[PDB]
Enzyme design. Structure first.
Site, PDB file in Angstrom:
ATOM      1  N   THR A  22       9.536  43.364  -5.805  1.00 43.22           N
ATOM      2  CA  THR A  22      10.258  44.667  -6.012  1.00 43.22           C
ATOM      3  C   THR A  22      11.195  44.709  -5.099  1.00 43.22           C
ATOM      4  O   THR A  22      11.481  44.250  -3.970  1.00 43.22           O
ATOM      5  CB  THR A  22       9.093  45.919  -5.763  1.00 43.22           C
ATOM      6  OG1 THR A  22       8.561  45.623  -4.542  1.00 43.22           O
ATOM      7  CG2 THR A  22       8.386  45.975  -6.498  1.00 43.22           C
ATOM      8  N   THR A  23      12.349  45.669  -5.298  1.00 48.68           N
ATOM      9  CA  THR A  23      13.293  45.967  -4.642  1.00 48.68           C
ATOM     10  C   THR A  23      12.843  47.041  -3.330  1.00 48.68           C
ATOM     11  O   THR A  23      12.218  48.017  -3.704  1.00 48.68           O
ATOM     12  CB  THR A  23      14.530  46.789  -5.225  1.00 48.68           C
ATOM     13  OG1 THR A  23      14.782  45.998  -6.506  1.00 48.68           O
ATOM     14  CG2 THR A  23      15.851  46.752  -4.351  1.00 48.68           C
TER      15      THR A  23
END
Lengths: 241, 196, 149, 231, 242, 244, 249
Positions: E29-30
């Site tokens: 994930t960012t």
């Protein structure tokens, strides 16, 4: 074959796995230079900050093992902190059981044995960092010892590290051939810092800044680091010579 | 043995005797009990000689490593290591330790560690055997935030009464001054505090 | 840099002290170092672009030292102090050296005065050869022209 | 045989391949579907006999009167996790005089599997759990992957043809959350959800096994002629 | 050859098992971290793979100590175990020295730990980058930790699929404030650049989470962002990208 | 990995035979010869070194002959290095018997023990066996003089005369043809030397390449006196048998 | 875990333990060192090589002391010898200074050190060390002795020997110079002359390490006034003295 993948000899008697460990300290593009002054030992080393988004004050290649012994590391940063930790534990160890601070000489020897032990196993990866220990001892005087991945170590009049360190070495050797002693004479440690910078600039062909350098100084009974401001003071004194 | 430390304005002064008894024979009368575990935090030993020296060595070993990785210890931080080793030998070792130090995170501090191991912050601390007779004098005559000279003379006077009433406290009085002016070792010979 | 505040901050000071330029130019007649110290702080930064910009300000300031026949001795010294320090990479003092040659010609200053300042300059430029050359020959030729006669 | 014969070797795709293989045990394996409201949680499991002269195999394990787990993959792998969860739940009752929470028991389980996949010679467990329970926070329904990662849902499925069951639960999603205080409705809807997972595996009164937990209801497994109240 | 363990080494001077582990987080994930003057603001993109999930229940933000925020990306079970060890470290320091561990001290210890599993063929490395920071008496600190065991000082950091999208904006943000900026204002920022790094995650949809440790609001403790402040940030980021 | 760097060295082969043991017998045939003969008055142990160099001192080399106890000595054929460990284990086992029973260890027991260690290496641990063959001279009170040969697999077999090391074939046959059961120590001393000169790895057998030792019952009362001869006494006996 | 307890020494399919053969190769890649045994002393000598011209050969030790009366010198790998000399000292102390009290016989100690070599060819996680040691010494029982320890874990007494890359040439050199009776002085000349042919750098006395286990010397013990007790029979020759010796070849 598979005598190059684990640390077992070849039909030459050579450990290729160990040799590869040296070949990784050029990948961070960090050079260091360390000379023995008259009453000090100075190590100046590159500091790479490729971005803004890296905060430059934190990017440190200088780890204090003792109160008196600094360590500057050339090569990958994980292995640097790992090596620093072992060394710190051992220094404290000796102070506890022998009643004085660990000699620089004995610390170098210690890490050499541990390095050999990491190449004695056949599933342990050598710590690829090259370590410079700088001190001013009260029995050995100014000292530089550089240990290496194989677990070989030897004392040093001066030393350099990095992908470009032949050039630096050439400079230093010629200086001690004119002076005919194994340590720079001056009498203010500040001017030994200045001299060291001049040789470095000649060697790598680039003038440095206050955030392209990070400087460590061991005087008697102490090691500390110069801040980035102190370094800018030195670069004015280049003009003044 | 008696040890004390007392805070003042600009830092903290540590005070000790130098006489060490076992039984009726004085083993030595010039052994310094003022011990350095950091440049800036010193501590004071009293009670059984071996126990306190042992713990003091261990704490120095641990604080060294603290400095080389995380930065310098605070006076607080240091007291805890003494405390916790005494907690692990609370049925075996009887130790009186006063940990006092001058910081720039916290200016002068006095922590004291009993036999069983607890840390206690106080504006002054006393411990030992002989320093319990000077206890009442301590609190009645104490002042908050004194001058440097006033602190030196207070410690001199407290320990004079201590040596008075206790034969195990004697010899020279030794003091260490911790400050942002330097670190000042002081020594008072017996005639000098017998006049008073 | 890793922050943008020195790039801006030195540029604010430069704009200001270039519209304070007449106030500074008259002050050099009274004592040139008192006027000059303010300009030197700008070149104590590690920003090579804005130090190049602030050497334009110095170049105007120092014309008065040349018209003076006492104060140009300390110009020679000032050049040293900047070159050996950094020279603000090598760019800042290169601009200074390049633009002085043209000024010497229009001033028509005394022969002694012009040689000794240019003599001090040809010393400075020797250590480099990577591009200084283009200027460097012109610098030496100004000594040459007088000495022909 | 480079990265598929070792359980210690990456993988520039940022995987361990063994975990994908362990997730293929779920495709060949049984199917179970969980769904919850805010007041009850329900598991509906498809039991499967070995042949027709065999009793059908129980697929729901009771871990406590506020907790249950159900498998869809390999049984011997499930045997380790059932023991572990019971141990930790009883430990919570002993030490903290507490029920053990649903989220937290999933977290303990996750990091357990991880250090047995870390150790060389180990295996990732190939059984996927649905962990239901009722604690202070209400009902919870966790999906436990062979990776070990835990996810919180109102309705989920795993096993063979679990995809259609999530379609079904996403459509009735706002229906069964706004039914509260009646566990019955949820069970009927769960039967319909696992009927989107058949392959002629039929649902009978001895194939269907139900388990619920409520605020006022213990963990109870319905079987027999008592699952025919919801058929 | 040289791709079967983590204690081979190549003549190139490279360890590929270790390098390969960074790619694990590249499919994660960012997550971003803004280094402030008063503190730090973390934000993490939480991908939504269905609408059966329960948003803000699936935690990636775990607090370590009472003042160090930790949020991680990459292979999730692995990262939860890395945080697991670090909580033990927190308690140990507190036990011996009676004070909460410092921010630099915690960074140090995790580096050692991640080092250990790339030195033996008998343990498996991690697959996560973690972002953590806080406030201590030495100031606010921010660190990112690679699965190689590398960390540095960070003005701003990111990782995940959209680490490029994030970092490009952080450069401009140091242009806007070359003196650094306030934690309170950085909350709105934090949302902004996850929305910008959701343009690499534009075939999915997301849930935004934000957490902060700042000395000027929360008294130097690590807490969550929620309620009215949270929805102000969500609204801000929306209008900008629209 | 760790199973990635092991090919499995100490399993059986498809003939029921241990890879490492079979390789070991070959490496012991590289090493010098050692012969044991049993007379009805003694046992003769005679060993030829596997190294003889330009300036090797062999005048004090006690590198094949070792006293395990004051009635049991060994001759060594194989790796000298490998042999060391078991030599000192044997010393310990022997002294232990004396310590607890107040009696000298039988030859049978001592050998059977060492064989067990060899068997133990391929049984557990992944470890290789020591590539050694021993010839044991020993006296006990239950079988009198006993002669044994042991191999790297861990098995013992009795003999009346036996040879190990280099050129076992040639030596063995000559010993069978020439040995009689009524020989003495004198006869056996000469028979061993003649056999070693048909198996010498140089073209001549020399006194400083010979280690020679006896256990004789000519010592009073029937006691056994072990003698490892001095280099001048070996030279002394070698001119007597008429090699040199 | 621990799955490395399978020996890393094995046999080859053609006989001959392959690992110790490779380890013996590393000695032929090593430096040259030699020992000449006299009949009233022993001399050992080695050459100092460094990887830097700024390196100190004044804190470099290739000839090291085990006990006052016994010295050691290697050829082969540096690192290997650095740990191995410490283990030699350690067993000598724990088994003959806490049990038998006095400094061991030369013969004894040589056997003991060979056992450690042996135990690095038995176990997993360890392959053997790749140096050969010359252990020169004197005991009052078996006289002067010079021994050579193998990377196989065997020992041999020699009359004179060399180890290193120039060992084969050196024993051919020693054949004609050697005699059963030697003085200690003459031994020094022979030793350094052979090692001059096994060095292909420049041959100084500042870069050549010389030591004798020759004459006793009492004042190196640390005390005087009991002559029944002496000081070290080992005596390292300082550099200026060795320079005098270069002229005496």
């Amino acid at each position: 074959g598979y005598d190059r993948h684990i640390t077992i000899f070849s039909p030459e008697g050579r450990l290729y796995q160990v040799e590869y460990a040296f070949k990784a300290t050029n990948q961070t593009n960090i050079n260091s230079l360390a000379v023995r002054g008259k009453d000090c030992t100075v190590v100046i080393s590159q500091k790479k900050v490729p971005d803004k988004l890296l905060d430059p004050t934190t990017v440190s290649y200088i780890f204090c093992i003792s109160r008196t012994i600094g360590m500057v590391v050339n090569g990958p940063i994980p292995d640097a902190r790992n090596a620093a930790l072992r060394a710190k534990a051992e220094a404290a160890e000796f102070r506890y059981k022998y009643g004085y601070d660990m000699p620089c000489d004995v610390l170098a020897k210690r890490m050499a044995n541990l390095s050999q032990i990491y190449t004695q196993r056949a599933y342990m990866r050598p710590l690829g960092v090259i370590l410079t220990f700088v001190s001013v001892d009260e029995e050995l005087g100014p000292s530089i010892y550089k240990t290496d991945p194989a677990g070989y170590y030897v004392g040093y009049k001066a030393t350099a590290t990095g992908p470009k360190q032949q050039e630096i070495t050439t400079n230093l050797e010629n200086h001690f051939k004119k002076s005919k002693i194994d340590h720079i004479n001056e009498e203010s440690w500040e001017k030994v810092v200045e001299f060291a910078i001049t040789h470095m600039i000649d060697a790598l062909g680039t003038e440095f800044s206050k955030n392209d350098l990070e400087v460590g100084v061991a005087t008697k009974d102490k090691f500390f680091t110069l801040s980035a401001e102190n370094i800018e003071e030195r670069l004015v004194a280049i003009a003044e010579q | 043995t008696s040890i004390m430390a007392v805070t003042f304005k600009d830092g903290v002064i540590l005070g000790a005797d130098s006489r060490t008894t076992t039984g009726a024979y004085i083993a030595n009368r010039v052994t310094d009990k003022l011990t350095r575990v950091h440049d800036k935090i010193w501590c004071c030993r009293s009670g059984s000689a071996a126990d306190t020296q042992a713990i003091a060595d261990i704490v120095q070993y641990h604080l060294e490593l603290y400095t080389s990785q995380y930065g310098t210890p605070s006076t607080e931080t240091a007291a805890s290591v003494f405390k916790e080793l005494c907690y692990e030998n609370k049925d075996n070792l009887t130790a009186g330790i006063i940990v006092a130090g001058y910081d720039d995170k916290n200016k002068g501090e006095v922590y004291t560690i009993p036999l069983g191991g607890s840390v206690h912050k106080l504006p002054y601390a006393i411990a030992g055997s002989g320093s319990t007779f000077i206890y009442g004098y301590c609190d009645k005559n104490f002042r908050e935030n004194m001058s440097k000279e006033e602190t030196v003379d207070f410690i001199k006077h407290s320990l004079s009464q201590a040596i008075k009433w206790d034969g195990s406290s004697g010899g020279v009085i030794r003091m260490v001054v911790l400050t942002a002016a330097g670190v000042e070792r002081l020594i008072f010979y017996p005639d000098e505090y017998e006049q008073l | 840099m890793s922050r943008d505040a020195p790039i801006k901050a030195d540029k604010d000071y430069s704009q200001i002290l270039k519209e304070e330029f007449p106030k500074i130019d008259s002050l050099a007649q009274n004592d040139c170092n008192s006027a000059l110290d303010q300009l030197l702080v700008l070149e104590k930064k590690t920003r090579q672009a804005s130090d190049l910009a602030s050497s334009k300000e110095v170049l105007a300031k120092i014309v008065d030292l040349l018209a003076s026949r006492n104060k140009w001795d300390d110009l020679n010294e000032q050049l040293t102090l900047l070159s050996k320090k950094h020279g603000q990479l090598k760019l800042s003092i290169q601009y200074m050296i390049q633009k002085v040659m043209e000024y010497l010609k229009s001033s028509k200053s005394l022969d002694l005065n012009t040689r000794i300042s240019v003599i001090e300059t040809i010393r400075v430029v020797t250590e480099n050869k990577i591009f200084v050359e283009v200027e460097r020959a012109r610098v030496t030729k100004d000594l040459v022209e007088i000495k022909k006669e | 045989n480079n990265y598929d014969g070792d359980t210690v070797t990456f993988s520039p795709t940022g995987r361990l391949f063994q975990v994908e293989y362990a997730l293929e045990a779920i495709k060949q394996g049984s199917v179970t579907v969980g769904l919850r409201s805010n007041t009850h949680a329900v598991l509906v499991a498809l039991k499967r006999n070995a042949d027709e002269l065999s009793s059908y195999q129980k697929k729901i394990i009771k871990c406590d009167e506020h907790m249950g787990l159900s498998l869809a993959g390999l049984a011997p792998d499930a045997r380790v996790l059932s023991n572990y969860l019971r141990q930790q739940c009883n430990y919570s009752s002993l030490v903290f005089n507490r029920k053990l929470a649903v989220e937290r028991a999933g977290h303990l389980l996750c990091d357990k599997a991880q250090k047995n996949t870390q150790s060389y010679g180990g295996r990732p467990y190939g059984v996927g759990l649905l962990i239901i329970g009722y604690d202070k926070s209400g009902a919870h329904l966790l999906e436990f992957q062979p990776s070990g990662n835990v996810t919180e849902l109102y309705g989920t499925a795993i096993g063979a043809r679990s995809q259609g069951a999530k379609t079904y639960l996403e459509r009735t999603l706002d229906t069964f959350i706004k039914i509260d205080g009646n566990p019955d409705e949820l069970i009927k809807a769960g039967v319909e959800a696992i009927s989107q997972s058949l392959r002629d595996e039929s649902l009978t009164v001895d194939n269907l096994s139900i388990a619920i937990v409520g605020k006022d209801t213990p963990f109870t497994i319905y079987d027999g002629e008592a699952v025919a109240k919801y058929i | 050859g040289y791709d079967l363990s983590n204690s081979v080494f190549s003549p190139d001077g490279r360890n590929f098992q270790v390098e390969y582990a960074v790619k694990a987080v590249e499919n994660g994930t960012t997550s971003i971290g803004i280094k402030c003057n008063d503190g730090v603001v973390f934000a993490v993109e939480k991908l939504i793979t269905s609408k059966l999930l329960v948003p803000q229940k699936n935690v990636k933000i775990q607090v370590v100590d009472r003042h160090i925020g930790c949020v991680y990306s990459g292979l999730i079970p692995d990262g939860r175990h890395l945080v697991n060890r670090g909580r033990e470290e927190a308690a140990s320091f507190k036990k011996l020295y009676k004070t909460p561990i410092p921010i630099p001290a915690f960074a140090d210890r995790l580096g050692q730990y991640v080092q250990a599993h790339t030195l033996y063929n008998s343990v498996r490395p991690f697959g996560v980058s973690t972002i953590f920071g806080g406030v201590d008496k030495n100031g606010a600190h921010l660190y990112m930790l690679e699965p190689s065991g590398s960390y540095w000082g960070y003005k701003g950091a990111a990782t995940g699929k959209g680490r490029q999208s994030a970092k490009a904006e952080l450069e401009k943000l140091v242009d806007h404030h070359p003196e650094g900026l306030s934690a309170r204002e950085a909350v709105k920022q934090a949302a902004k650049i996850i929305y910008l790094a959701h343009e690499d995650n534009k075939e999915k949809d997301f849930e935004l989470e934000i957490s902060w440790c700042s000395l000027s609001e929360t008294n130097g403790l690590h807490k969550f962002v929620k309620g009215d402040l949270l929805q102000e940030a969500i609204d801000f980021a929306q209008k900008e990208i629209n | 990995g760790s199973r990635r760097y092991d090919s499995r060295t100490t399993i059986f082969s498809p003939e029921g035979r241990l890879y490492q043991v079979e390789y070991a017998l070959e490496s012991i045939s590289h090493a010098g010869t050692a012969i044991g003969i049993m007379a009805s008055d003694g046992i003769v142990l005679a060993a030829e070194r596997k190294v003889t160099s330009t300036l090797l001192e062999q005048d004090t080399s006690t590198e094949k002959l070792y006293k395990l106890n004051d009635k049991i000595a060994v001759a060594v054929a194989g790796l000298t290095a490998d042999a060391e460990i078991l030599i000192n284990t044997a010393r310990i086992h022997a002294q232990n018997y004396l310590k607890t029973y107040n009696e000298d260890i039988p030859v049978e027991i001592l050998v059977r023990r060492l064989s067990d260690i060899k068997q133990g290496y391929t049984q557990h641990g992944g470890l290789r066996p020591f590539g050694v063959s021993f010839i044991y001279a020993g006296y006990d009170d239950r079988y009198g003089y006993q002669l044994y040969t042991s191999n790297p697999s861990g098995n013992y077999t009795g003999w009346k005369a036996i040879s190990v090391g280099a050129n076992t074939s040639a030596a063995q046959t000559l010993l069978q043809m020439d040995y009689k059961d009524d020989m003495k120590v004198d006869d056996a001393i000469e028979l061993a030397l003649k056999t070693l000169s048909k198996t010498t790895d140089s073209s001549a057998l020399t006194y400083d390449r010979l280690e020679f030792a006896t256990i004789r019952k000519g010592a009073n009362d029937g006691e056994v006196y072990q003698k490892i001869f001095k280099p001048q006494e070996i030279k002394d006996i070698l001119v007597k048998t008429g090699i040199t | 875990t621990d799955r490395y307890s399978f020996s890393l020494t094995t046999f080859s399919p053609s006989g001959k333990l392959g690992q110790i053969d490779y380890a013996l190769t590393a000695v032929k890649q090593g430096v040259t060192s030699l020992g000449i045994k006299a009949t009233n002393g022993v001399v050992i000598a080695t050459e100092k090589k460094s990887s830097s011209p700024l390196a100190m050969s004044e804190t470099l030790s290739k000839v090291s002391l085990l006990t006052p009366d016994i010295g050691a010198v290697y050829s082969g790998m540096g690192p290997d010898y650095r740990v191995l000399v410490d283990k030699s000292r350690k067993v000598a102390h724990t088994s003959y200074k806490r049990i038998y009290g006095e400094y061991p016989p030369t013969k004894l100690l040589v056997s003991e050190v060979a056992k450690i070599m042996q135990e690095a060819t038995q176990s997993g996680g360890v392959r053997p060390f790749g140096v050969s040691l010359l252990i020169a010494g004197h005991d009052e029982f078996n006289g002067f002795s010079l021994y050579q320890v193998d990377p196989s874990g065997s020992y041999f007494p020699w009359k004179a020997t060399a180890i290193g890359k120039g060992s084969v040439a050196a024993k051919t050199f020693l054949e004609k110079r050697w005699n059963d009776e030697l003085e200690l002085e003459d031994a020094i000349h022979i030793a350094l002359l052979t090692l001059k042919e096994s060095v292909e750098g420049e041959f100084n006395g500042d870069t050549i390490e010389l030591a004798i286990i020759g004459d006793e010397n009492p004042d190196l013990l640390g005390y005087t006034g009991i002559p029944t007790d002496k000081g070290p029979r080992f005596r390292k020759l300082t550099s200026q003295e060795i320079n005098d010796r270069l002229e005496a070849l």
